[PDB]
Amino acid sequence: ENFLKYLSTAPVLLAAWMTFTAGFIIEANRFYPDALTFPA
Amino acid sequence: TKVKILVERDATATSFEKWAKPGHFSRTLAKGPKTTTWIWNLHADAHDFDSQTNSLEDVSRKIFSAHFGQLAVIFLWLSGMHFHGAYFSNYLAWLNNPTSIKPSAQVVWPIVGQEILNADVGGNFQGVQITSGFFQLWRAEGITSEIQLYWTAIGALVMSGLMLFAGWFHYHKAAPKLEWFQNAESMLNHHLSILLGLGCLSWAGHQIHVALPINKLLDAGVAPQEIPLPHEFLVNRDLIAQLYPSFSKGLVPFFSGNWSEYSDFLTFKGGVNPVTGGLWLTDTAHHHLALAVLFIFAGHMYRTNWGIGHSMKEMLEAHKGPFTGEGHAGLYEILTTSWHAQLAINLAMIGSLSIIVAHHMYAMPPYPYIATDYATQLSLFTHHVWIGGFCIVGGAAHGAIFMVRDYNPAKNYNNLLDRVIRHRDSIISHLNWVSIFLGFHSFGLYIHNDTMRALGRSQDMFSDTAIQLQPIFAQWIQNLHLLAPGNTAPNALTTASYVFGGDVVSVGSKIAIMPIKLGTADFMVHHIHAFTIHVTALILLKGVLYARSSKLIPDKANLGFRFPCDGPGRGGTCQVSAWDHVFLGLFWMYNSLSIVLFHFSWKMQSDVWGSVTPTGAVSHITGGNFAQSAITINGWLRDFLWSQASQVIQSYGSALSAYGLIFLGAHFIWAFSLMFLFSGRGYWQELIESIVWAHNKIKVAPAIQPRALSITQGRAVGLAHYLLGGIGTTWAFFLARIISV
Amino acid sequence: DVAGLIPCNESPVFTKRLNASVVKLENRVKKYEAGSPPALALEQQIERTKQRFDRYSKSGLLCGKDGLPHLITDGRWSHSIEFVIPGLMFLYITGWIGWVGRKYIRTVGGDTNATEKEIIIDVPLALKIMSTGFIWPISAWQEYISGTLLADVSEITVSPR
Amino acid sequence: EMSKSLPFLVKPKQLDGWVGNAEFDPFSLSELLPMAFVRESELKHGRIAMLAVVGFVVSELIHIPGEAYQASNPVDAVNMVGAQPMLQIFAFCGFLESVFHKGKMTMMDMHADGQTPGDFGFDPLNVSKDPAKLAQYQLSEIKNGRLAMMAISGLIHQSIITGHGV
Amino acid sequence: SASIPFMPKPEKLDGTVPGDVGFDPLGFSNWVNLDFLREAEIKHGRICMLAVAGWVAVDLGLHLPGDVHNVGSLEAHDTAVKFGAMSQILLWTSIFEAISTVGVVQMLNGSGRQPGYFGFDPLNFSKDAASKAKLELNEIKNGRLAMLAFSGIVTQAALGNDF
Amino acid sequence: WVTFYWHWKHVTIWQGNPAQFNESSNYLMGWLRDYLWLNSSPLINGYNPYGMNSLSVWAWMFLFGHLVWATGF
Amino acid sequence: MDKGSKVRNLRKESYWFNEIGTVVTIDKSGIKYPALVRFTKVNYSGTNSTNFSLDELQEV
Ligand code: CLA
Ligand code: CLA
Ligand code: CLA
Ligand SMILES: CC1=C(C/C=C(\C)CCC[C@H](C)CCC[C@H](C)CCCC(C)C)C(=O)c2ccccc2C1=O
Ligand code: SF4
Known part of the structure; x- marks a missing residue:
């Protein structure tokens, strides 16, 4: 319980969520790079 | 047995319950957040153990285990460095051809086009060129293979794990009692005789048995593949006797006293190795052996359990003269009852030592092929200079903290501290006068030269072809050091460093090290250095002495170490605390070290670093424009900043583009810091009030009320961003100016 | 067309930029043996550059006198692909975020430990709320027309109002 | 009192009154989310997997004139140009999801009063005759749905690696 | 002390761990959970038996x-x-x-799970009559033997082909 | 900002290569290099060890303004 | 008005102006500001209560 509650603290969750967002953004740019504009 | 081991078993229970109660350590923060200020406080008082418990034993146990944690972090950092050398570096190719191959141990994933940062360093390898001199260090150790680097990283990881376990064990399982910590004599004996004595002895053994033969074979041109493994140099003595035909005699000369027989690999030639451009490995081996002997001897000075030894308490009490009342009576209690005093001394010494290291390493390149790596030399010098300045200012800050918190007048009656506090006014007034005198004269020399050069009166300036200010004393010292070999150091074949005088040591057509001539520009810049150092000392010493009281605030001590002010009364009372004195001293230290780094960079580029021809002609990087252009402010602005900033501004589209981006980012952060530095808290509080009204109008309102940063936090953030911006700007400038080569 | 811009499909400067990039990459790779990891990386970079330029040519962007694509953001539907479409996406995503956040604020706010639930997030409730953001526009409009979006004038203010 | 599917974990609770009570929840995601919504999602994923697996098998068997012929479905769907058909089907699926959920769109809105998971009426075949037969068929539906999810994942990925999924 | 008769009577040992004989010179068990050690030993033994x-x-x-x-x-x-x-x-x-791993955490928390309990008895070789303790002693002992034997086999085959 | 924009655009137009601004004004490094670093060369060279010219006064005032700006801090 | 009753603040200078606070105590022994009120939010000084006169409170 205590460990999960600690994982629920603001800094830990912010770090985890920002890492997740950076990860999926990086992957999206990896599979569809140089995306200046939308495909037709 | 007065010195004995005392511990408490199971001092603290291990559980995660506390991890879910942030701010548990402090009594005020344990009540939960009412406003956002709480958040900041939780990160500001995290390591302020003294303010969390009134017992010294608990603070001591926290400090010990936090030091264990720091050691674990450092070992993890070393493990990472070594692993990136083994798996992601061109260390082998650099080994084969050190001159041409550029060191690099970092690789970037190609994700957004950042793969351009993968430079064409060489050796069929692409990566970010490193400037940490790790390749030269590893070569000096005779690594010669990536398996050894891999195992070095594994050992570092295991050591980091051991440090973490030791911290946990010595807090939660076996926490030493306070009496255990208060053993200065035993601690000094153990840290001198073993940590520094046997450390030197073991490293000397390594050099004698591993680094020496391997590096000698490498200098002879043996390819790393054909060099036998280091363990092969420990089993068959003859295999080493070929290189140094003194092992054949073995250890019998050592015990018989005929140490002269070891002069083959224990030399005192000094100078620099012409092939690699670094110090002779035999010289370093003899050096470390002598240091090991001295440290082991010095580790027996203090009395621990057997009558013989020195009692530092009596030693201090004994030194008292007519001018100083009670002499050093009460300093032992101060240094064994307050961690802030010890931290102040240790930080000041570590910072000064780091600066000494920076000065000595460039003058006498200790590792092979580090002298001609201009990028490494500059990076190491500037890094260690910055570390030294930060440590010095931290020592000042913690001295002030000790004065505010751990200073007790009852135990400090008419001793040195009392008397210093009692003529602090005279000390500060005279330091102020000398600071003003130095500033006026030194900087007005530059202003005068600039004015005369602008008016066309070049014959009236303070230049070599004009009114001359020759550093005669420094030149005399250089001459004496030049003449030392054979006369005052008869057993030393060559001068300690070629800076003072002698030949031009060049490796692979690059000037590794050459004599540095001192002219009027050197005189002026040295006096500028002295001025800045004196002003920084003024600020920090004033903060320390007036930390408890002043003619403005007779009761400053009750206000604490760091507080914003004491109101707008008595005129104004802004930045009256010692913490604010540290805040200003950090700015002045940054300024002084910036001047030091500019002096070093320009002088080395214009007078030492360069190229040589087969005949012997010297061509420096900037053509020796330091003598006639370093004597005016406009000269520094034009020939140093504007001229040498071409690399950063033009680095776009190349592997150094990251340096240009960081140049701009550092400028941005430096300018951003001014927002906190100039503005005050009231404006931002009112703006936040308006923004909070806007949020509330939509039924969005955080339970944790937003608050503008406290005054002290505003200053701290401004200073932190100012320092980051300045340091990053110079970092990018130097690295791009010295990597386009 | 638009402001004297010629489509990048028939832009000589655009092709010159493509050629310059490719040729400089080729000059860089000429100092590595064929098949070496650096050579493969540089060849992949060349291929990625060619694909990027081809995609820009085929997309329909407008080039300038400098050969670089220019964006038209006056609402022109033929150029919505440049700004309007992504913008909407942003306003959706952020909208979602904002809405979700507001909901959490108004969900844990009715508790004695409301502050304690902001430093420590109630991850189950937090994810419950976060999964509901895909209908943020509808819920926002319903609250607006229902009077539950904005607070009444009876709220905190300052001496002069 | 002890787990069944994984006989080395404590039996998770809040899993009794449910058709697929095989007692499999190591990471305890059920404890992290409302059971009704997540089981309804299980039903939806299973039904979509069933439809997708049938649709992939049929396509690789027979086709529609002029809609592309004799190709792997992951490739044919790519071969659609202009997104003309896919947006139509997307809007149709949204229409039906809205009709079925009756406007209780999200999880919090969903399960307002009863909203039994995955019912949506639509049972013309004579059922609800008794809890026994109805629960038997529901358990069959869950098992077949999970099997369909795995089958469709496998078929689509095996088509990706190979040319034809089979 | 069992086996080694001059060692200091292993602490927190015996009464459990059918495979124990009282051989704990370093005695890690005293300062660490015994359940975790049992799980580690059993898993190493199983993996290495399969490896041999x-x-x-x-x-x-x-x-x-x-x-x-x-x-x-x-x-x-x-x-x-x-x-x-x-x-x-x-x-x-x-x-x-x-x-x-979920099960290991539960065991440490006090879930009551035995160290290597994975309920894997398709042919139920174990029976109340067979005696689970008798069946386990062989399991643990042959597992330790396999651990050591495989270490030796890999090492001395890296030296020279064992066969 | 306004004066920098006006001056750089007019300088590029006067030089006869307005393309330089159109190219380098889209990123900040362009402002730092092609406008400040590039156009200050005739200024900081008002007086050098080789000699001085009519602009020496302006270079002196340049350094003076820098000094006063710093003193404000 | 009474103990435990919610009152809207009307003091213009107050940090909790136009806010709801719960009455803690009322002094019937004369006094100019007898009604002690407590608010959820803490002001800039960290306090969350103040004395008001009954004229400076809207009852509910
Ligand atoms: C041996 C080294 C050492 C040790 C053990 C301490 C220990 C302590 N110091 Mg001292 N100090 C040191 C060095 C040290 N300091 C140095 C070198 C300086 C000079 C700057 C100071 C200046 C100083 C002051 C002025 C004060 C302390 C205080 C304290 C106490 C609280 C520290 C705390 O809560 O951390 C909290 C830590 C943080 C909030 C982290 C902030 C770290 C910086 C700001 C950011 C680092 C940026 C990073 C390096 C790069 C970023 C890159 C970017 C791109 C993201 C504690 C007793 C405070 C006190 O009251 O003690 C009684 C106090 O007022 N110290
Ligand atoms: C470049 C701007 C600048 C300048 C010139 C100064 C100048 C000075 N600072 Mg300041 N300071 C600055 C920026 C500057 N600071 C910034 C940015 C900070 C923020 C961190 C500080 C923070 C700071 C602190 C905290 C302290 C100083 C101190 C000092 C003094 C050092 C002693 C000295 O040199 O006296 C000599 C004066 C000069 C060299 C100024 C130039 C004068 C020239 C040479 C001659 C001028 C011509 C002449 C007067 C002609 C007269 C006639 C004319 C009027 C017509 C001096 C007054 C220290 C101090 O006052 O104690 C000693 C001190 O403690 N400063
Ligand atoms: C979910 C929280 C939330 C919401 C709904 C809003 C909504 C708004 N803000 Mg506020 N704001 C927030 C958080 C939030 N803000 C935070 C955390 C900060 C501190 C950085 C600010 C600082 C701020 C300022 C300074 C200003 C606004 C303004 C505004 C308005 C215009 C939009 C805007 O400028 O956004 C700007 C948003 C930011 C600058 C930072 C947002 C950072 C993240 C994305 C938001 C927090 C998300 C958080 C993780 C929620 C998690 C939920 C989860 C636990 C379930 C709008 C009313 C402006 C205004 O008054 O307009 C009239 C304005 O001037 N906001
Ligand atoms: C800008 C400013 C503020 C307002 C600044 C605030 C409230 C800081 C806002 C911080 C935000 C909310 C955190 C996120 C910031 C970055 C996006 C990343 C995090 C940076 C570090 C905190 C890690 C003051 O309160 C202030 C007080 C006294 C003197 C000067 C100033 C001052 O200059
Ligand atoms: S301006 Fe700020 S620091 Fe100065 S007296 Fe006023 S409150 Fe204190």
């Missing part, structure tokens, strides 16, 4: 139909990582190990 069986099986026998299996045990790891079978076995063992 595989190494002897690869010894010029039972090779799979694929041509890549003409390769020997020493080169098997490299050929498998290149072939990618190794990555897949990693995937499946990782899945099993995570599901078992």
Whole structure:
């Protein structure tokens, strides 16, 4: 319980969520790079 | 047995319950957040153990285990460095051809086009060129293979794990009692005789048995593949006797006293190795052996359990003269009852030592092929200079903290501290006068030269072809050091460093090290250095002495170490605390070290670093424009900043583009810091009030009320961003100016 | 067309930029043996550059006198692909975020430990709320027309109002 | 009192009154989310997997004139140009999801009063005759749905690696 | 003290762990959970028993139909990582190990799970009559034997082909 | 900002290569290099060790303004 | 008005102006500001209560 509650603290969750967002953004740019504009 | 081991078993229970109660350590923060200020406080008082418990034993146990944690972090950092050398570096190719191959141990994933940062360093390898001199260090150790680097990283990881376990064990399982910590004599004996004595002895053994033969074979041109493994140099003595035909005699000369027989690999030639451009490995081996002997001897000075030894308490009490009342009576209690005093001394010494290291390493390149790596030399010098300045200012800050918190007048009656506090006014007034005198004269020399050069009166300036200010004393010292070999150091074949005088040591057509001539520009810049150092000392010493009281605030001590002010009364009372004195001293230290780094960079580029021809002609990087252009402010602005900033501004589209981006980012952060530095808290509080009204109008309102940063936090953030911006700007400038080569 | 811009499909400067990039990459790779990891990386970079330029040519962007694509953001539907479409996406995503956040604020706010639930997030409730953001526009409009979006004038203010 | 599917974990609770009570929840995601919504999602994923697996098998068997012929479905769907058909089907699926959920769109809105998971009426075949037969068929539906999810994942990925999924 | 008669009577030992004989010179158990140690020992033993069986099986026998299996045990790891079978076995063992990690945490918390309890008895060789304790002593002992034997086999085959 | 924009655009137009601004004004490094670093060369060279010219006064005032700006801090 | 009753603040200078606070105590022994009120939010000084006169409170 205590460990999960600690994982629920603001800094830990912010770090985890920002890492997740950076990860999926990086992957999206990896599979569809140089995306200046939308495909037709 | 007065010195004995005392511990408490199971001092603290291990559980995660506390991890879910942030701010548990402090009594005020344990009540939960009412406003956002709480958040900041939780990160500001995290390591302020003294303010969390009134017992010294608990603070001591926290400090010990936090030091264990720091050691674990450092070992993890070393493990990472070594692993990136083994798996992601061109260390082998650099080994084969050190001159041409550029060191690099970092690789970037190609994700957004950042793969351009993968430079064409060489050796069929692409990566970010490193400037940490790790390749030269590893070569000096005779690594010669990536398996050894891999195992070095594994050992570092295991050591980091051991440090973490030791911290946990010595807090939660076996926490030493306070009496255990208060053993200065035993601690000094153990840290001198073993940590520094046997450390030197073991490293000397390594050099004698591993680094020496391997590096000698490498200098002879043996390819790393054909060099036998280091363990092969420990089993068959003859295999080493070929290189140094003194092992054949073995250890019998050592015990018989005929140490002269070891002069083959224990030399005192000094100078620099012409092939690699670094110090002779035999010289370093003899050096470390002598240091090991001295440290082991010095580790027996203090009395621990057997009558013989020195009692530092009596030693201090004994030194008292007519001018100083009670002499050093009460300093032992101060240094064994307050961690802030010890931290102040240790930080000041570590910072000064780091600066000494920076000065000595460039003058006498200790590792092979580090002298001609201009990028490494500059990076190491500037890094260690910055570390030294930060440590010095931290020592000042913690001295002030000790004065505010751990200073007790009852135990400090008419001793040195009392008397210093009692003529602090005279000390500060005279330091102020000398600071003003130095500033006026030194900087007005530059202003005068600039004015005369602008008016066309070049014959009236303070230049070599004009009114001359020759550093005669420094030149005399250089001459004496030049003449030392054979006369005052008869057993030393060559001068300690070629800076003072002698030949031009060049490796692979690059000037590794050459004599540095001192002219009027050197005189002026040295006096500028002295001025800045004196002003920084003024600020920090004033903060320390007036930390408890002043003619403005007779009761400053009750206000604490760091507080914003004491109101707008008595005129104004802004930045009256010692913490604010540290805040200003950090700015002045940054300024002084910036001047030091500019002096070093320009002088080395214009007078030492360069190229040589087969005949012997010297061509420096900037053509020796330091003598006639370093004597005016406009000269520094034009020939140093504007001229040498071409690399950063033009680095776009190349592997150094990251340096240009960081140049701009550092400028941005430096300018951003001014927002906190100039503005005050009231404006931002009112703006936040308006923004909070806007949020509330939509039924969005955080339970944790937003608050503008406290005054002290505003200053701290401004200073932190100012320092980051300045340091990053110079970092990018130097690295791009010295990597386009 | 638009402001004297010629489509990048028939832009000589655009092709010159493509050629310059490719040729400089080729000059860089000429100092590595064929098949070496650096050579493969540089060849992949060349291929990625060619694909990027081809995609820009085929997309329909407008080039300038400098050969670089220019964006038209006056609402022109033929150029919505440049700004309007992504913008909407942003306003959706952020909208979602904002809405979700507001909901959490108004969900844990009715508790004695409301502050304690902001430093420590109630991850189950937090994810419950976060999964509901895909209908943020509808819920926002319903609250607006229902009077539950904005607070009444009876709220905190300052001496002069 | 002890787990069944994984006989080395404590039996998770809040899993009794449910058709697929095989007692499999190591990471305890059920404890992290409302059971009704997540089981309804299980039903939806299973039904979509069933439809997708049938649709992939049929396509690789027979086709529609002029809609592309004799190709792997992951490739044919790519071969659609202009997104003309896919947006139509997307809007149709949204229409039906809205009709079925009756406007209780999200999880919090969903399960307002009863909203039994995955019912949506639509049972013309004579059922609800008794809890026994109805629960038997529901358990069959869950098992077949999970099997369909795995089958469709496998078929689509095996088509990706190979040319034809089979 | 059992076996070693001059050692300091292993602490927090015996009364459990059918395989124990009282041999704890360093005595890690005193300062660490015994359940965790038992789980580690049992898992190492099982994995290594399978490893010995595989190494002897690869010894010029039972090779799979694929041509890549003409390769020997020493080169098997490299050929498998290149072939990618190794990555897949990693995937499946990782899945099993995570599901078992939940159980290890529960056991430590006090869930009452026995160290190696994975309820895996398809042919229920165990019976109340057979005596689970008697069945386990052999399990633990042959597991330790396999641990040591495989370490030796790999080392002395890296020296020279054992057979 | 306004004066920098006006001056750089007019300088590029006067030089006869307005393309330089159109190219380098889209990123900040362009402002730092092609406008400040590039156009200050005739200024900081008002007086050098080789000699001085009519602009020496302006270079002196340049350094003076820098000094006063710093003193404000 | 009474103990435990919610009152809207009307003091213009107050940090909790136009806010709801719960009455803690009322002094019937004369006094100019007898009604002690407590608010959820803490002001800039960290306090969350103040004395008001009954004229400076809207009852509910
Ligand atoms: C041996 C080294 C050492 C040790 C053990 C301490 C220990 C302590 N110091 Mg001292 N100090 C040191 C060095 C040290 N300091 C140095 C070198 C300086 C000079 C700057 C100071 C200046 C100083 C002051 C002025 C004060 C302390 C205070 C304290 C106490 C609280 C510290 C705390 O809560 O951390 C909290 C830590 C943080 C909030 C982290 C902030 C770290 C900086 C700001 C950011 C680092 C940026 C990073 C390096 C790069 C960023 C890159 C970017 C791109 C993201 C504690 C007793 C405070 C006190 O009251 O003690 C009684 C106090 O007022 N110290
Ligand atoms: C470049 C701007 C600048 C300048 C010139 C100064 C100048 C000075 N600072 Mg300041 N300071 C600055 C920026 C500057 N600071 C910034 C940015 C900070 C923020 C961190 C500080 C923070 C700071 C602190 C905290 C302290 C100083 C101190 C000092 C003094 C050092 C002693 C000295 O040199 O006296 C000599 C004066 C000069 C060299 C100024 C130039 C004068 C020239 C040479 C001659 C001028 C011509 C002449 C007067 C002609 C007269 C006629 C004319 C009027 C017509 C001096 C007054 C220290 C101090 O006052 O104690 C000693 C001190 O403690 N400063
Ligand atoms: C979910 C929380 C939330 C919401 C709904 C809003 C909504 C708004 N803000 Mg506020 N704001 C927030 C958080 C939030 N803000 C935070 C955390 C900060 C501190 C950085 C600010 C600082 C701020 C300022 C300074 C200003 C606004 C303004 C505005 C308005 C215009 C939009 C805007 O400028 O956004 C700007 C948003 C930011 C600058 C930072 C947002 C950072 C993240 C994305 C938001 C927090 C998300 C959080 C993780 C929620 C998690 C939920 C989860 C636990 C379930 C709008 C009313 C402006 C205004 O008054 O307009 C009239 C304005 O001037 N906001
Ligand atoms: C800008 C400013 C503020 C307002 C600044 C605030 C409230 C800081 C806002 C911080 C935000 C909310 C955190 C996120 C910031 C970055 C996006 C990343 C995090 C940076 C570090 C905190 C890690 C003051 O309160 C202030 C007080 C006294 C003197 C000067 C100033 C001052 O200059
Ligand atoms: S301006 Fe700020 S620091 Fe100065 S007296 Fe006023 S409150 Fe204190």
